[model samples]
Target: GRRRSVQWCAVSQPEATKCFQWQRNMRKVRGPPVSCIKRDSPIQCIQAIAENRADAVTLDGGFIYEAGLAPYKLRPVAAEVYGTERQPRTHYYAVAVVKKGGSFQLNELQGLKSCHTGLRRTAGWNVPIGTLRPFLNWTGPPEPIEAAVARFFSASCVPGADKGQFPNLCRLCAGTGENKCAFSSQEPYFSYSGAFKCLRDGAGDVAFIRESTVFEDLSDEAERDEYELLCPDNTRKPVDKFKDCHLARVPSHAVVARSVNGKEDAIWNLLRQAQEKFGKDKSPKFQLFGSPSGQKDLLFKDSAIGFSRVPPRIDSGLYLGSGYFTAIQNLRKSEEEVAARRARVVWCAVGEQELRKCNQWSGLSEGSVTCSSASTTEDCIALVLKGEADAMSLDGGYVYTAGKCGLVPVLAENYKSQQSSDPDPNCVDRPVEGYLAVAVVRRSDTSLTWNSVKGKKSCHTAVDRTAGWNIPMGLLFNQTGSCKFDEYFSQSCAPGSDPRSNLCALCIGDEQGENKCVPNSNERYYGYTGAFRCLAENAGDVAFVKDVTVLQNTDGNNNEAWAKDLKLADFALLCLDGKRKPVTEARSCHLAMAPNHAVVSRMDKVERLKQVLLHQQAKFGRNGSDCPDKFCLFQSETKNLLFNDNTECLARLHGKTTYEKYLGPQYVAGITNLKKCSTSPLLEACEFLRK
Candidate 1:
C-alpha cells in the first residue's frame, strides 16, 4: 500500500535541491521514490501539505504550532536530534551572541542594529522577540510588530519582513534593496550561519542564532573567543556556556505531515530508512545532514545527528510543551488582533458560581468585557498565561502564584471603609488597605491562644489560601520550624487538603454532602464565611480567617440557621502576642495584614485592562448611578464573582508595580519560604522556566 513517490515540501530552492539529491540517494537504496514540491515560504508549505500538494516538511517549533492549528491540522512525524552522537536530544538552546567587549547588554538592545535568521524561525526570531516584548513598546493587536521593532532598533536584518512597509526593519540586509532580507540564503545575511556572518561583518551589533552557529562557523578557538552569549539575566557568558546561559531552550525542528490523507507511516518509514542509509556519518558522498558551503541548514538542521520518531497521538502543543508553545504563539499574533483582544478584558472564572457572575458582568458591559471559565484558579492562571483570558481577581495567595507564572497585578480590590469611617468613591486612586488575618474562636473557648492552639481541632478556609492558610500557617511554620501543619493541628477542617490527612477530617461539603475539602464556597466550610460557620457550629475549636468574617456572619447579617442568633460579641480572636481580644480588636489581635484581592494579566495588556476596569467600575460600582437597577459590581447573591463583593472599587496599583513589587518583599519571602516545604506543579513549571 505504498505510493511510488512521496511529495516533500521544500521552503526554498536550496532546500529543494537538497531534497532532490536525498531523493536520488534514497531511490539508489530501494527506498520510496521522493518528489519535491517547492514553496516560497513555510506558510505556503503548510498550505500545500493541508491541500494534499505535499506530504511532509521540516518546520521550527513555532511553525509546527501554526501548521497544527485548525484547517491545517498537521502532526509532527519525527524530531531532528541535536548535540553529540553520544548525547543527542530533541531540543537546543536559542542563544544571542555579540562581539566580545561590546558596550551593550542583553537588556540594552534599544537603538542597536540586530540580525535575525528569519521572520518566524524559532531560535532566530521567536525566542529573542518574545524575550524582549516588554521593551518593544508595541501596543497589542493590529499594530505592526515590525513598526515597533523598527523604532526600537535603528536597523535590523529580519528576513521575510515587508521591506516597503518597514524599510528600517530591513535596512541592515546585505541583499539589494528590493530583494533585501529574503527568508533564504538568497540574501547574504539570512538563516543561522548567515545571521552570524552579518554580525561578524560588523553590520549588526547582536545576532539571534542557534547555539551551534558560532562553534560551527568558526572552527578556530581564537575566533570563537571573539563572541559571547547574551543571557536573559542581563549578563554575558563565554560562547561555550550556552547550555546554561541562553535566551530560551527551544524544541528542535520537526518533520510535519497532515493529520489526515497524509501517509504518516510511509513518511516515518522513509525517514527512518533514509537516515539509516544517508545520515550524518552514514554516507560520505551524499550526506543527508550536510549543506552546501555557502548555504546552511538546507532541508534539515546541519547539526542534527539523526531523527527521532515522534510518538503517535502527540499533537504539536504537547510536542512543543506548554512553555515553548506560549512563547511561540505570542510572537505569531498580529498587532490589531492583540489590540482588539486587549480592548476587552476577558475575565477568567473558576467554577460555576464565578462563571455565572462573570457572565452577568459580561452582559452588563454590553460587549465591553467577556469571560473564560476554568475548573480551578490554577487552570485560570494557565489560561491567562496562554492569553486565552486577559485577567482574574485573585487573593493574596493566588497573586503570588500568578506572579510567578509571569502575570502582573494591574488593579487591586479596595474594601470599603478600610482606612476611613466613610466610604470613599475615590478609593480607586489609593492603595488598598490589607485585611487583618485572624484566628477566630467562640467566646466559650477563650482558652485558645496562638501558642496554646497547637494539637487542637482547627478550621481553615483552604490550603494555600491567603487568610485561611498562608498567613496562619506561615506564622506557625516560623514558630514551629516545620511544614507539618497537619501534625500541629490534631484534627482540622482545611478544605482543599488531602482527605486522608487529618487536615480534612472535620470538613463538611455543601447541603448535598458533596465537594468537601474544596477551596471554593461550594464547601460548607470554605472561605472566610464558611470557616466562621464551622467555628460557630462547634465543628472546630478555632477558625483561621480574615477579620470581617465574624462581623459579616453574626448579628443577623447571615440567614443561615446556625448564624441566625449569633452575635459579634460571641467570638474572640487568638492573637500571636498570646492574648484573646474582642473580634472588633482585630487591629491588635490578627496574624498578619494580607493584601486584598487584585486583577492580574499579562504585563503588555495591563494598561488596557486597567482602563477598561476603571470604566467598568465607574458605571457598575456600588455608588455609581448605573448600579442598583442596572448591575452591581461588588454585590453577589451566593459568592463573589470577578471581584470581591466587599470591594469598593478597583484601585490603581502604584506606578507599574511588578509582581515582585506588588506582592511586597515580605509576602514574596514568606511564599518563597512556604514553597520550599511543598511546591505545586504550576509553581515548579514557572520556576524551571525562570531558571
Candidate 2:
C-alpha cells in the first residue's frame, strides 16, 4: 500500500520539516515523503478535493467553515497551536503589521495614502482576505495573487498619494515576484517551501502572517533573509494595547479519520491517542457541532468543527437559563459599576402636564428623572387604598368619601386646596369648587334659555332632594323660589331611584339649610310622602317647590312644563327663611279657581263644595289675589304655573304630622281632617286638568 504523509506542511519547507518531525513522533511511526504541498491559492484545495486527487486536507478555520465543506465530509488532520506558561493555549490572536518606518498608527489603519506602502499575504491570501475585507470594506472578486497584492498596496498600503504618507492600499501581502504570482494560481501553495519563496522573492510591501509559523522557523536564512517580522510598538498589555481590535473569527481544528464501520470504535481511539500525546495542548480543539439535536453524526461525518469569535449561532437563550452569569465578567464587582448609573431617589406623582411644569421650574427639559404614568397620583392612591380605585377625579365631596374608604392622599395639586388633613378623617367633607353646573335642554328648544322657566311646568329631578341634596336645593331656590312637593315630586328627590325625576320642578327646594324638610309640621305640603314626583306628575301640572340646585343645573328649560320664580306668597301666607323655619302668625293658603273648585266637589262627592268655593270667591274677588284662601285668576301662564308647581308648599303638606301644636290632643284629628279635605280637592282638581 502507498503510505500517506503524516507530516503537516505550512507555506514553507523548514516549517514542513518541523511539523513532519512532530507528526512522526506523535504517530509513533515513520511517515512517507516529507514533501510540501504547493498551495498557492486557497481555492485549489477545494478543487483538489473535488477532483478526488487529494487524500486529506488542511486549511484555516474560516475558509473551511464558511465554505461549508463539512457537509462533504472532509476532515482536518491537525491545527496550528499557541501558548505561554500562564495562559491556556489558544490559537487565536490578531496580528497587525506595518513597514519598519511607516509614519502611521498601525492600530487605526486610518489615513493611509497610495504611495508609501508595503504588503504581503501569508499562509496564502485566504485568511487575510476573508478576515480583513470587512475591516477595510474591501469589495472585489478574488484576483490572481500578484494583482490582489498590487491592488491592496494601491488602495491601502501607500502613504502619500491622496491623503497622507500612508497609502490607499493596506500592505496586506509583503514580498515579491514569481512566488507571489505562483500563489495566485495553484493549491498546496501555502506550504513552507512556497511561503519561503514568496517572502524571499514576491511582490508587495508588507504582510500579515500567522504568529505560529514565524515562531516555528525564525532561524532559517531562506525565511529570515527575505522577511522582517513586525512587533508591537507599545509594550502595553495585550488586552489593553489592542483593546479595540477584536478577533473577527476564531478557527477550530480537529483531527478526523474515516469511520470504517457505522459504529467505529476507532474514532474514540484516535481522539484518545491525540489527547494523550498532546496533553490537551495539541489535542484537537473543537466543540460538538449540533448537541441541540442530540446528533453527533453531522459533525462526526464532516470530521471537523469550527467556531467564530462572533458566534456562528445567535444562541439567544444563553442569557435565559441558570448559567446566564457564567459568561459575564466579574458579576459581583459589576454590581457597583451598574449601581453608579442609577439616579438619586426623588418621588414624583403627577399628571404629564404637571410633570412638565415641575420640570420647567427645575430648569430642565431632559435628565435622569424617570417619568412614568404608573407613578401618577391616581396610581399611588390606588396602591395605598387596597382597592381597585385608589385615586379618583371627583368633586370634593367624593374625595371626602374616598378618604372614609381608607385611602390617604399623599400628594395633591398645589393649586388645589386640601380641606381635610392628609390621611383624612372619616367625617369631614372636603369642599371643592372648581366645577359649575350646566343645564341641558332639548335641542329643539332653541329659545329655552338656561333659567327661563317663565310658564312651562318645570320639573326638578327628585334625586337632588335626598339626604345629601343641599347643593341642588340651594341653587334652585336661590335662583328662583317656592319649591313644590308631591308623590310625583318626592320620588324624584329620592336618591338612587329613578333619574328622570332628578329635575322635577315640583320637588325643588332650598338647600342652604334643611336638606329635606323639617321632621314634623302642621302644614300639609312639605314632607317626604308617597312618591313626590309621581304625586306632582299625577296632578297633571308641575308642582312648585322651594328650590333645588342640581335639578336646575341638570335639567333647566328641558321639562315640558317648566315654571319660573315662585314665592311663598304664591301658595301660603307664611314668614320663613329659605331653610323653611316658620315665622309666627303664618297662615296656610291655596288657589281656588271656578273650574278647579267644581272638579273638587264632583270627585269628592261633597255636596255644595263648589258653592262654598264660589261664595268665598264672590266675597274676596279676583282683584285681591293676595287674600288668603281666595280664588285668584292668574294674569299669565307664568303666574299660574308658579302657583301650581309649589314644591316647597307641597313638601310642607307631606311634612305635616297627624297633629298641630296649638290644637292640643285634638291636633291629630283636626290635622287629619284638614289633610283629607286638602288632598281630596287637589286630587279631584288634578283629575279634571288631565281630562
Candidate 3:
C-alpha cells in the first residue's frame, strides 16, 4: 500500500526541491514519508496549512506569531536547535555585520548603506529597526517606515519596499529596475543570501542579519576575517564569536502547523528521523542541513545543528517568547497606534502591596492611568521594556539597572527639608534635593564606631538597595577591598538575599512564616520602617536607612508598641569618618547624599506620562484638595506604597536626566565598586536584557 505522505510547504523552487530530496532521503531510512508542496510566499503557505492543503512549513519567528493569530491559528511543531551540541538552545543572536576597518559603531549608523533580508523578517528587519528607532528621528505611524529609514541610511537594499514612494530605500539593491528589491528570491538581492551578497559586493556598508551569515557564506578564512560583528555595546568581534557579541538574542525559527488537523506528532517524528539520517555531518550524499551551492538556508538554517520537538501545549506566542514577540509586534504597528497607547500611563507595580496601591490609584485617576503587576521589580522593568507597561518609580539602585536596559527617568520625588523648599504652583518643573543615607544606632549603644562596628549585628532595608546596601557596602569595600560582607558582619538581616546565606539569619518573615529575606513588606523586617523597627526592638544594634526614616517611625508617629514612646532624640547616626551624632545631625554625619526615587519610562512616552502624573499629584498630593479623606499621595497605613510617605511633590528631573545621570556620577561609581565585591540578581537580569 502506498502511504499517504505528509505535504510540506516550501517558499521557493530551490527550497521545494530540497524538501523533496529530504523526503526521498527520509523514506530510505524508514522515516515518515513527506511530500513537498510549492508555495510562492509565506502567507500563501500559512493559508495552505490552515486549510489542510499542506501539513507544515518552517517560518521566521515574526511570521509564526502572525500565523498563530485569529484565522490561521497555528502552533510551532519543532524549533531549530542552535549553538554547540554541548550547549544547544532554541534561540540565536541578531547581529549587525560590518567590515572590521569601518569606523562606525552601532551609535554611528547614520547615513550608512544598509542591507536587510526582505521585509518584516526577525533578524534582518524587526530587531535592527526596533534597536535603531530612537536614532532614526522618525515620529510615530501614518508616516512611512521606509521614508524614515531612507532618511536615516544614505542607501539601503530593503527588499519589499514600494519603489514608487521610497526609491532611495532600494538604490543599493542588485535586482533590475522594476523587480529590484522585491520581497521574493525573484529579486536577485533578496533573502538572507541576497542581503549578505549586497554587503559582500560593496553595495552596502552594513548588513542587518543573523550570526551565521558570514560563517555560511564566506568559505575562505581571509574572506571571513574581512567581516566583523557590531555589538550593541559598540564593540567589534570576529565572525564566530557571536555568542559573546550580539545586538539582541532572538527566538529560533520553527516548523508551524495549523492548530487543528495538523498532524503535529507525525511531522516531529519525520524531523527527528530525517535529522538523524541526513543532518549536518550525518550524510555527505544527501544533506538535510546543508543548502544547495550558492544558496543560504534553503529550507532551514544551514547552521542549525539539529531540531527539537516543540511541546504540544506551546502556542505560537509562547514559542516566540515575550521579548521576541514584542519586537515583532512593534515593527508591525504604525506610529499613531503606538502614540495612542502611550497616551494612557501604564504603571508597573511589583508585589501585592504595590499592586493594591496601584489599583487604588488607577480607580482614582478615572481612566487616565492603569496598572500592571509582576512578582518582582525586575520583571516589571522587563515588562516596561517590552512595552506591556509604560512606567514605574524605582529606587536609586534599580534606576541604574533600568537605565542600562534603556529606560529614562521622568520624575523625581521632592522631600521638603531645610536644604530644599517647594516652588511654583504645581511643583512640576523644580529639581528636588536628594536624601541623606544614615546608619541609626540606639543611644544606649555608646561602644559602636564606624571602625569597630565590623562584626556587630546590622539591619538593612533590603539587599542592593540604595541607602541600605549600596552606600554602606561601597564604603566598606573601599576600605576592605573585598565583598565578603557576610563574613564582615557577625550576623545580619538583609531581605531579598539568599535564605541559606547568613544575610537572612536574623530576618523574621510575615505571619505566614513565608517570604523570608524578601525585599517587600511581606517580610517583617524589609524596608526603612522595618529596619528601624528591628533596631528599636533590640533585634539588631544598628539600622541603615534614609535620614527621614527615623522621624516617620518614631516619636509617637508609629503606634507599634516598640516605637510608641520612641523619640528621634534616642537614635544616633554613624558617620563615615568614625563618629556618631543625633539623627537630626545627618546633614553632616552620613555615608552619602543619594538621589531621590524617580519614575522611569521609555523615552518616547515620557512627555505624556509626565503630564498625567503632574495632574494626579495636583489632585492627591500632600496639600491637595482631596487629601486626608479621599486620597493622600504621601501617606500609607502600614508600609510605603507607590510614592514615599514623606514626598512633598513630584518634580521634573534635570535636563532629561537618564538613569545614569539621575543616579549621579558618585552614585554610579559607588554601585559599580560595590558590585565588584557582591552580585545582584536584578543587575544580572538587566545585563540579560542587553543580550
Candidate 4:
C-alpha cells in the first residue's frame, strides 16, 4: 500500500518535518500516504518533480509559468483557496495600499518610498510594474526595467533585486548587515507580511501587496481602518473594497505536477484528505496551513483556507488569464524583443482564405508583415482593441466600430477614378470620391422597385457592413419607426445573425453548402460578391450591395460559375424614390455615398504601421513589377481575398483620421441613428471599459 504513496517536495527542514507529520497523520487515518522529499529551492523541487523523484510542489504565479515551459511540462493540478470559508476565493487582489490622510492617489506615486513582497512576485512586482508602466519610463532590458523602477520611486524595498546595482530600490529594506535587502525572509521585508510591516513601521509611504496583507499583519486590529486602496480611477477606498479598487486580481499559487504521468490523481487525493483533516483549524496536531515560529508559509500559504482542484484543461497560461499572463510576460521581455513587436505589424485576417492570402503577402514583405486569424471580423476588431493584432482593413461601418474603440484610420482603399486615360500615378495623394451604396435586382423583376420591395426575400453582405447593412437599414429605419427590419424582409441572408432566425433563411454556404450564415468568406452568401451571386442565382429578390459590385460581377467581368452567363443588361439598381434604373445610374439613384474602406490601428503603432504597410504595398501592389510574377496585394482571382480586387492603391488619410471626420458627419449620423435599435457586443464592451 505504501508503494502508491505520494511524494511531496519540501524546500526547508521545517517544511520537511511538517510533511513527515502529514505522512504519519495520513497513515494513521488510513488515507493516501504522503512521502516527504527535501529540496533547497523551488527550482530544485521543480526539477525533482520533473525527474519523478518528487511528485508535486506549490509555486507562486511567476514560477508557475516557468515550470510549465519545455523540459518540465508541469500543469497546475490544485490551487490554494486564500479567503475565509464564508467566501473562499481561488484568486486574490493585488492592490496599492496607502495610509489614511495621505492626499495623493495612485497616479502621483513618483518620488515616493515603496515596499514590495519580493522581486518578480505577482502582487509585489509584476502587477504593479504593469500598472505603473506609462509613468515608469521603462525602456526595456539591457538598461533594465529595474533601473526605471528605481528612478521612478525615491526609494523602495524590492527584496530580490541586486542591491549593489540598484541601491535606491534597497534603501527602505529593514534587515541587519549580512541579511540587509536579501531576497529571503532574513530581509524581514520580503514577502506579503514583510512588505506590510515595512509600510506599518513607517519605512515606506505605500505598500505594494495583496489586499489581505494589512488585515493579517496589523498590530492593532483597528489599524486596518487606517489604510485605503489606490484605485485605477485615481480615487481612494477602504482596504476591504479591493474587488473594485485593486491594480489586478491574479491567480493563487498552485500544486504543479508533470503534464504526463505526473500522478495528478494521487496528488489531488493527498491534498484533499490533508486539507480536510488539517487545513486551517481542522486539526491541531498537524497544521497543514500553519508553520512554527519564523517559518512563514511552508508548503502552502499560511492563510490558505483549503485546496481547490484545477481542471486538466487549465494550464499555466489559462489559469493566469490573458491580462495577468501578458502582464507577467511584459515584465520579463528584453529590449530588442519589445522593440521588434513595436516595429512589426500583425494584420488580423478573418477565416482561412484571408489567412492564406495574408501569409502569402507576409512572406513578400520580409519580416514587416505578419498575420493573426479570427473566425469573424468582429473578433478581429476586438483583438485590435485588446492590442493583440495591430491592424486590418475595414468596411466603413467597422471603421466606425474600430474608431469607437480608440483606433485611427491609417489609409483609405482608393479605387479606379473615372479618368481611365490618365489615372493619377501618385495614387496615395488622390482624394477619395467614395462609392455608391446601391440596391440591385434582376432587370426582369421590374416590379421590385425600392418602394414595393418590402416583405420580399433579400440578400445582404454581412451584417454591420456599410452598403449591405448600415446604409440600406438606415434608410428603412427612417421610413419605419419600428426596429423590426427582420420583418421587413420575408426571408434574408444577413450573415452574423442567429442561424435559426428568418434573417439567415436565404443564406447558401460554401461549395459543400456548410458554414451557412457565417460572416466570412467561408459562406457563399457573405460578402459583396457572395450577395451579388445570391441575387444572380435568384436565391433572393434583391441584393443590398455597392454599385461597383453589380458592374464588376456582370458584363463578362466576373468569371464565377453563377455570374458566367450574366450580362450587364440583366441587372438594375433600386432607387430610393420608388423606381428602378440601369446599374450605371448609381451616382444619381443610390441610397448613400459610403465611405471607402481603410486600414486602422492603435495610436501607438500609427507611424511604424503606416510606413511598413506603405513599403509592402509598393512591392506587391497592382502596379508593382512583382505583381503576377511573384505576389499581388490587390488581385485575388476576383474573390477579394485580403482586400477588394479593384483597389488601385492605399490612399493617404490627409487630415481625416477619426471616424467622425473620415467617415463624414453624414455617414456617422446614419450608423448612429440606426444603432438606436441595437448595438454590437464588442463595441459596447469597449465603451463600457473606457470609462
Highest TM-score among the candidates is held by which one?
Answer: 1
Give the candidate order by descending TM-score: 1, 3, 4, 2
lDDT of all predictions, in order shown?
Answer: 0.81, 0.28, 0.80, 0.84
Clashes of each: 11, 144, 4, 0
lDDT of 2 at 483: 47
lDDT of 1 at 407: 71
> How would you encode candidate 1's per-residue C-alpha lDDT over 1-691 as one tens digit per residue?
2355778988899999998898888878888678888999999999988988888999987689889998899988888988877777667678899998876787799999999998867788877887676667777556877888889999999999998899887888988756688887789999998899999999999999988778889979999999999865567889998865676667778999987767887888888888888887887868878889899998888988888777563567656653366566566655555456647888988777878878998998868799998866777887776667878888888888887766778888888654235877578787767888999988885567777998999999777888889988888888889978789898899987887889998888788988878767678787777788788889999898887777778888777778889988888998888899998888888889888888888754666787788888888887776898878888774245566667888888776365777778989899899988897656765554343
Task: Report the alpha-carbon TM-score of model 3 versus the true structure.
Answer: 0.66
Whole-model lDDT, candidate 1? Answer: 0.81
Model 1 spans > 4 angstroms off = 1-60, 63-115, 123-172, 175-188, 192-339, 416-420
**What TM-score would every model get versus the actual structure?**
0.68, 0.23, 0.66, 0.62
Clashing pairs in 3: 140-335, 141-335, 141-336, 496-517
Residues 1-691, candidate 3: write the lDDT tens digits: 1236778999999999898798887777778899988989999999988888888888887688789987999988888877778877677677889886887888799989999997777778888887676567667566767778889999998899888899888888877867888898778778788888888888999898887767878788888888998865566788887765666567678899877767887888888888888887988869878787888888789888898776564566556544456556666566655445647889888778888888888899878899898866777877787667988878888888888766778899877755335534655555677889999899887889888888888999988788998888777877888868887687788987789988888888887878877777788798888898878888888899988888888778787777789988888999988889988888999888888899988655677888898888888887677787788866785377777887778888767566767877778887887777766554654443333
Answer with 2 or 4, whichever has the higher lDDT. Answer: 4
Deviation from native of the Cα of residue 496 in model 2, angstroms: 58
lDDT winner, 3 or 4: 4
Off by over 4 Å in 2: 1-63, 73-88, 97-127, 132-244, 247-252, 256-266, 274-691
